[PDB]
Design a protein around this ligand. Structure first.
Ligand SMILES: [Mn+2]
Length: 134
């Protein structure tokens, strides 16, 4: 009654652990794409990879390596965004997990966003985030 409330709940599409730190010495944002867990199987298991990028920036998106046939990949990758601190406040970091497929569109598994204006810089941020439907 009931069903409508269940439909509003966050779907079980897995989670991604990432870390974030602004390097004030070099003036760049550092992002760690650590691992994902409990991904749904779209293939069976999926072939997950993560796209990492800033909005509204129109720059080419960074991507992790593809991890074949796993619902619990460990990426252990780091990415760097050369952006002065004063300009970072208006941007939003996006992390999106996709299922690599060689013969068809890569299905999105889920994504989430981290507005830079609500992040506590000066201390390394690390958290698990539930992937949201795209
Ligand atoms: Mn696949």
């Amino acid at each position: 009654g009931g069903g409508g409330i269940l439909d509003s709940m966050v779907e079980k599409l897995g989670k991604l652990q990432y870390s974030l730190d602004y390097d004030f010495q070099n003036n760049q944002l550092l992002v760690g794409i650590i691992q994902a867990a409990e991904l749904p199987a779209l293939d069976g298991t999926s072939d997950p990879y993560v796209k990492v990028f800033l909005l509204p920036d129109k720059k080419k998106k960074f991507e992790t390596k593809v991890h074949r046939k796993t619902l619990n990949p460990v990426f252990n990758e780091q990415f760097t965004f050369k952006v002065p601190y004063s300009e970072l406040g208006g941007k939003t970091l996006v992390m999106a997990v996709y299922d690599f497929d060689r013969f068809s569109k890569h299905d999105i598994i889920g994504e989430f966003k981290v507005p830079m204006n609500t992040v506590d810089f000066g201390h390394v941020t690390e958290e698990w985030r539930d992937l949201q439907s795209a």
